[PDB]
Amino acid sequence: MKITNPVLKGFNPDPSICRAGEDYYMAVSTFEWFPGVQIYHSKDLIHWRLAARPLQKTSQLDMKGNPDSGGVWAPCLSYADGQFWLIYSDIKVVDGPFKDGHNYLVTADAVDGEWSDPVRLNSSGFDPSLFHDPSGKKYVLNMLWDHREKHHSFAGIALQEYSVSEKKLVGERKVIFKGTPIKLTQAPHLYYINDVYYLLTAEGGTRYEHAATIARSSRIDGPYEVHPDNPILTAFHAPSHPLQKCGHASIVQTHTNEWYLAHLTGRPIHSSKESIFQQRGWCPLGRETAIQKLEWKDGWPYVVGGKEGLLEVEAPAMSVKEFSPTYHIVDEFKDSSLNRHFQTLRIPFTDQIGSVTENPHHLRLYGQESLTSKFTQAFVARRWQSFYFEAETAVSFFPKNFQQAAGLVNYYNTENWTALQVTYDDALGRILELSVCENLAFSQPLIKKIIIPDEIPYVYLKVTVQRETYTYSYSFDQQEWEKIDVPLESTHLSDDFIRGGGFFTGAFVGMQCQDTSGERLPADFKYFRYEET
Amino acid sequence: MKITNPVLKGFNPDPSICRAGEDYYMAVSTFEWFPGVQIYHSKDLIHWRLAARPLQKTSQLDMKGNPDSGGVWAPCLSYADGQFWLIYSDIKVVDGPFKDGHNYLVTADAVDGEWSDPVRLNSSGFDPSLFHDPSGKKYVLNMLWDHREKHHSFAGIALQEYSVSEKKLVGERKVIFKGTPIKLTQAPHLYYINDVYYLLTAEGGTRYEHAATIARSSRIDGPYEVHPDNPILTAFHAPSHPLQKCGHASIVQTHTNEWYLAHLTGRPIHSSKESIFQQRGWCPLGRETAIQKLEWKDGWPYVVGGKEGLLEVEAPAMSVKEFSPTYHIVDEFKDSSLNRHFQTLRIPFTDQIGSVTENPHHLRLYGQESLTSKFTQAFVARRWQSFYFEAETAVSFFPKNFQQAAGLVNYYNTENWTALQVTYDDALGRILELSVCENLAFSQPLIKKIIIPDEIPYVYLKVTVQRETYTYSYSFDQQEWEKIDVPLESTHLSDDFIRGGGFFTGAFVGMQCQDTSGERLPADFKYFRYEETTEH
Ligand SMILES: O[C@@H]1[C@@H](O)[C@H](O[C@@H]2CO[C@@H](O)[C@H](O)[C@H]2O)OC[C@H]1O
Numbered sequence A: 001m002k003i004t005n006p007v008l009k010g011f012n013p014d015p016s017i018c019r020a021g022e023d024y025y026m027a028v029s030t031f032e033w034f035p036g037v038q039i040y041h042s043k044d045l046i047h048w049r050l051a052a053r054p055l056q057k058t059s060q061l062d063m064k065g066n067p068d069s070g071g072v073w074a075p076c077l078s079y080a081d082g083q084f085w086l087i088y089s090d091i092k093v094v095d096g097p098f099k100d101g102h103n104y105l106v107t108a109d110a111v112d113g114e115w116s117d118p119v120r121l122n123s124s125g126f127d128p129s130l131f132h133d134p135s136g137k138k139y140v141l142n143m144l145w146d147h148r149e150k151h152h153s154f155a156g157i158a159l160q161e162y163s164v165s166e167k168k169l170v171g172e173r174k175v176i177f178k179g180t181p182i183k184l185t186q187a188p189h190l191y192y193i194n195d196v197y198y199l200l201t202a203e204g205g206t207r208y209e210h211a212a213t214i215a216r217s218s219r220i221d222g223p224y225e226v227h228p229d230n231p232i233l234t235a236f237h238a239p240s241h242p243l244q245k246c247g248h249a250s251i252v253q254t255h256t257n258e259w260y261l262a263h264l265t266g267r268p269i270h271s272s273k274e275s276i277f278q279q280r281g282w283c284p285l286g287r288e289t290a291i292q293k294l295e296w297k298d299g300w301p302y303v304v305g306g307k308e309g310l311l312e313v314e315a316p317a318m319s320v321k322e323f324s325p326t327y328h329i330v331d332e333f334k335d336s337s338l339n340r341h342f343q344t345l346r347i348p349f350t351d352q353i354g355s356v357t358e359n360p361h362h363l364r365l366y367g368q369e370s371l372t373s374k375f376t377q378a379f380v381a382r383r384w385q386s387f388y389f390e391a392e393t394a395v396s397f398f399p400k401n402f403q404q405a406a407g408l409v410n411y412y413n414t415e416n417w418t419a420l421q422v423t424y425d426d427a428l429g430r431i432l433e434l435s436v437c438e439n440l441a442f443s444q445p446l447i448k449k450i451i452i453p454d455e456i457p458y459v460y461l462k463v464t465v466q467r468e469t470y471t472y473s474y475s476f477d478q479q480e481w482e483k484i485d486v487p488l489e490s491t492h493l494s495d496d497f498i499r500g501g502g503f504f505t506g507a508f509v510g511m512q513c514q515d516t517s518g519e520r521l522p523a524d525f526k527y528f529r530y531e532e533t
Numbered sequence B: 001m002k003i004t005n006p007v008l009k010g011f012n013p014d015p016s017i018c019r020a021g022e023d024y025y026m027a028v029s030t031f032e033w034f035p036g037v038q039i040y041h042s043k044d045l046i047h048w049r050l051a052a053r054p055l056q057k058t059s060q061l062d063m064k065g066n067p068d069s070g071g072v073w074a075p076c077l078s079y080a081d082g083q084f085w086l087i088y089s090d091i092k093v094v095d096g097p098f099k100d101g102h103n104y105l106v107t108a109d110a111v112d113g114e115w116s117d118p119v120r121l122n123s124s125g126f127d128p129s130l131f132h133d134p135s136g137k138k139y140v141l142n143m144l145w146d147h148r149e150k151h152h153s154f155a156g157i158a159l160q161e162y163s164v165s166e167k168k169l170v171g172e173r174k175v176i177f178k179g180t181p182i183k184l185t186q187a188p189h190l191y192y193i194n195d196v197y198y199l200l201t202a203e204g205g206t207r208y209e210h211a212a213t214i215a216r217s218s219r220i221d222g223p224y225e226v227h228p229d230n231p232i233l234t235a236f237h238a239p240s241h242p243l244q245k246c247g248h249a250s251i252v253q254t255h256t257n258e259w260y261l262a263h264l265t266g267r268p269i270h271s272s273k274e275s276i277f278q279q280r281g282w283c284p285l286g287r288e289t290a291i292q293k294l295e296w297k298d299g300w301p302y303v304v305g306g307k308e309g310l311l312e313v314e315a316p317a318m319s320v321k322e323f324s325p326t327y328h329i330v331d332e333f334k335d336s337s338l339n340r341h342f343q344t345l346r347i348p349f350t351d352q353i354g355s356v357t358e359n360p361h362h363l364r365l366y367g368q369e370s371l372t373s374k375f376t377q378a379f380v381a382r383r384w385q386s387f388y389f390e391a392e393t394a395v396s397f398f399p400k401n402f403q404q405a406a407g408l409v410n411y412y413n414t415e416n417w418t419a420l421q422v423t424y425d426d427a428l429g430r431i432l433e434l435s436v437c438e439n440l441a442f443s444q445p446l447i448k449k450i451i452i453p454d455e456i457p458y459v460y461l462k463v464t465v466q467r468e469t470y471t472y473s474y475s476f477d478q479q480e481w482e483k484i485d486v487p488l489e490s491t492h493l494s495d496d497f498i499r500g501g502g503f504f505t506g507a508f509v510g511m512q513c514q515d516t517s518g519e520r521l522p523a524d525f526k527y528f529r530y531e532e533t534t535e536h
């Protein structure tokens, strides 16, 4: 009867909420993880099921070589004229003065149906949004990226008409809003409400200064006046609040004439050696999606409970409906294709990297490139979505040289991961090795190599995650586990720990095989258990 | 007449020398520059002409997104059984514990003919090489990359048989050599000389500790005995020597029964307010190729003149054969094909970025991504090949917003370049802007903006390179020039300045257009001049 935030747990940022009659959908960004964009469905705003992942083919999304946290940034999902519209980006440069990336449009009739081939829109900035103006005309909003040395990089909100018949942006482009002193003006969404235009934006950047700003105007092109108690959403001032980084919002008006606001947020683990006011913490689950309720006064919306958001939010006047779980707690790969919660890095899942059919009821992975490669990785993984869980798998892998390895991986990006892999030692045979990579600093800490007897058909591998730490354990028969006494830090796989300009995903766990010799040696995984506790 | 080194000036590393009858060929690496591999041709070893660039299709080489100084590393060109064999690499990771990359083989009847589609070989290490054993067997050598924490990454030289009929490696591989205390053992090339196997390698890394070591064995798989005066080539001990980084060599026996050694080298610019011992210099021309004469004693080759290598080298007993230049000093773009000294970053030249046929007598570049992008840049460039030159172009470009810019660029990688571009300012109209990117730190130092009047159809742009410094200048009438008073440092476009694990190319100059608004706004370049000051 209450909305319990985050409604989308783990890596699920930049929520774009829309209503198709009485059905509610939210699209979230996926960056380098393939297939692109996740769409969730809900009938009550409390329970959400993973319904679709539109960008399924390289003709829609080609991300081989994309930088970490490049690819699909904030998307925009809308419904109008009997079809869904998805505006998405493919960001190619995430560091330095430029942010080279391109905005595209695909359409579909059903969210889980077949999506069109993309139409080129523009490249002038990220967070593109498609606004269906009451007049029938259509408009694309985005932030304007300004590379010039002396200018703040977030130059404001651009507006330009989209011609449906010509399938291109037309007319003149106009900057309609420059933002507030919070700056980093971002995430524009336009709304026609009571004959006036409301421009919702994000400001402050997506770390702990994040905020949602709103302004209004009589004309679509402004000038816009800013909310008198702006920002309407932020946790910048409340470091102990359990919801942090609260911004990048979208508004929905329900079919019950109620008002709600979806936004991203982070749930940080804290230091204890440090003050939370100075060290705001680390978010291994990345940026998650939460929903707040809005109330109106004098033509201005307000977040009920205050600007920081609540964990428990007043659900709308609608019939509750839960959904069946969309993954197996223990997946034995008996299904025809990979479950919808598994994703690959950058490229589609094809025989290049593995198969679910070649060895039935197994996931076969052909050894390809290492975990530091932005190109071709034989790696299938799924999100951390709880601070407390166990993941476990069983691998048949018989490597012949030290350049072959396969096993269980916990992963943030190409420079930040840990891996417990079956590999080969030329003087010891098959061994089990722990490899740790922290901002490209690589170590293999076990001084005592773990030998695997030759006739063990399956090495059982398991990770136990307990909030701020996690540990690996292994078994040669499943009913007898041995724990590796190296406590790994969960905070080292978080938005707030990794270096670089792209820090936008979250921790993953999955099965991986690599063969840097060229032989493409396969690794057979009998099952994958993901059990939150 | 002597051989004058370097024989290939500017960015021309990892020479693989090769002989077909009385014709000599040398392949060099090209990294992210497309098309891949440069093959030069010679009949006297003194004069070399740019003859072919084999890897022209995305089916042979797909480098979109490749890191700076990834892509085509050291190649191997050989001639046997009436055809050419090219072994090349595509490196995808250049930083950190791994070096993910793949080695391929392609063949052709002539170097400037159509090359085959690639056969996969292995992925175990770079510097792959094909050996043609007198028994008719074929073998692939390459270094072995060890990623493990406690091990030196250069784990020795691997050897494995290649089956021509099965189009794949067969049998087991074996490490046949582990190097000397110089380590970083790489660049393996096998030679069968009077019933003895000689294994040539590079050691020391490609900076100032570079060396060429050689060893011999009665059997192909070792054990190998190292040269008694090893290494046979290096300038590590001679900081003042005009050739530095001397290593990564290959040997050829001429049809005159003489022996020569092709190797890479750097010609550094030195600061005479810095220790020549501590700071060995900066090479904006990258790694170039030189040739040394060999001489034998007791079954060991020695480099004539000492192991530092000579600047002037005794030529083989062959007739001089000079070649006419393969580029125009002023290229006016009247051909429907880009001159062979022009390259693009990572991808083919297609309508996606440019056209020489849409506006006749112009190079039209369609505005695409910035100079920091590893994907789709409308950028056509050619090597710095002298310390003294000027390059010049003329651009027709009418930008309508600040995200459109086109002009003349000096470039090393995506983090290191300068650019003089026609662009647009909301308050001032068309302006000429100087942009500087030093290891991704970005500046635009002109305080007073240069206003371009609306009546000006072409803006003329020039760079004048004078060894350690270069300067841009511009003109609205081709005859009256104004110098932009900020001296730029040529040493910042050098192997020795840029950060990261990939530092393997060299400085380029070329024409560029970017449009990060999305409109693909075209810029038309009327000509490109590149004129070396041979007087110096
Ligand atoms: O576009 C989305 C936003 O949530 C956010 O956008 C900005 C990207 O650059 C960062 O430096 C800013 O902090 C951030 O606000 O991140 C990317 C994507 O998730």
Ligand SMILES: O[C@@H]1[C@@H](O)[C@H](O[C@@H]2CO[C@@H](O)[C@H](O)[C@H]2O)OC[C@H]1O
Pocket (backbone or CB within 6 Å): B013, B014, B029, B073, B074, B126, B127, B184, B186, B204, B205, B206, B207, B248, B504
């Ligand atoms: O493969 C060629 C070699 O000349 C050289 O190989 C090594 C690559 O890693 C660097 O750290 C070493 O110094 C270098 O010797 O560079 C690449 C290519 O030119």
